């Protein structure tokens, strides 16, 4: 799931 968690890390970036 780590490789996925990196991809979820993309759109949650600080607005």
């Amino acid at each position, epitope marked *: *799931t*780590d490789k*996925i*968690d*990196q991809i*979820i*890390h993309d759109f*949650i*970036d*600080k*607005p």
Partner: antibody, heavy 122, light 109 residues
């Protein structure tokens, strides 16, 4: 199984840089964002700053000029540097990870190590 | 900046009763990113619920969050003595991050 190990200098004289550091076991810097908060004694929580593995840092709008946070994934650790501190900054500093709050993430919540009491006194 | 107003700010209840804590956002929260922290005196805070309705691991089902948009609420059912502490509501959706002024849950006598 993530665990955060924080070490830093508790006692400092006024107008001295505050350097604290927090270490990450069990998880990568790239997977989760990291942030630093402080709780003054018997008062509400305050969020000083947040950091990403890429070096991008977003700071509380009040303290922006004084605070700078730097993170190095090489050692899997991130450090908070603050300058021109004053007695008003006396507080207990906690290094935490912002809430994930998504179904897909592993260990979907947040965990942090025991805060370091920082006392600024002449 | 989203200012957080917790109410009433001091809650006096007794074992067996139902506790309702309120947290209100100055501005809309688009992504429903909210959390609730339990802090006992002299002890580090423990995150309790995250998001809107999601409960953190290690806590009984009697703690339940609800709400959306501008208004959020935390409910404690059949409170045991160990639940009394100070509770903060936090918002990670939109920069800058902010915490609520806190609600003190005390034991009625």
């Amino acid at each position: 199984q993530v665990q955060l190990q924080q070490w830093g200098a508790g006692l400092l004289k006024p107008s001295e840089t505050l350097s604290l550091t927090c270490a990450v076991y069990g998880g990568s810097f790239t997977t989760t964002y990291w942030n630093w908060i402080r709780q003054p004694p018997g008062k509400g929580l305050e969020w000083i700053g947040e950091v990403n593995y890429s070096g991008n840092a977003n700071y509380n709008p009040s303290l922006k000029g004084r605070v700078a946070i730097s993170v190095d994934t090489s050692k899997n650790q991130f450090s908070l540097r603050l300058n021109s501190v004053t007695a008003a900054d006396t507080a207990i500093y906690y290094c935490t990870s912002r809430i994930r709050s998504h179904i897909a993430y592993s260990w979907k919540g947040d965990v942090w190590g025991k805060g370091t009491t920082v006392t600024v006194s002449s | 900046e989203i200012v957080m107003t917790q109410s009433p700010g001091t809650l006096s209840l007794s074992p067996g009763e139902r506790a309702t804590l309120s947290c209100r956002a100055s501005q809309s929260v688009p992504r429903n990113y909210i959390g609730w922290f339990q802090q006992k005196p002299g002890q580090a805070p423990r995150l309790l619920i995250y998001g809107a309705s999601s409960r953190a691991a290690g806590f009984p089902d009697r703690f339940s969050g609800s709400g959306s948009g501008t208004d959020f609420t935390l409910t404690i059912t059949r409170l045991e003595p160990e639940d009394f502490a100070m509770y903060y509501c936090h918002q990670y959706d939109r920069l800058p991050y902010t915490f609520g002024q806190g609600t003190k849950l005390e034991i009625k006598r």
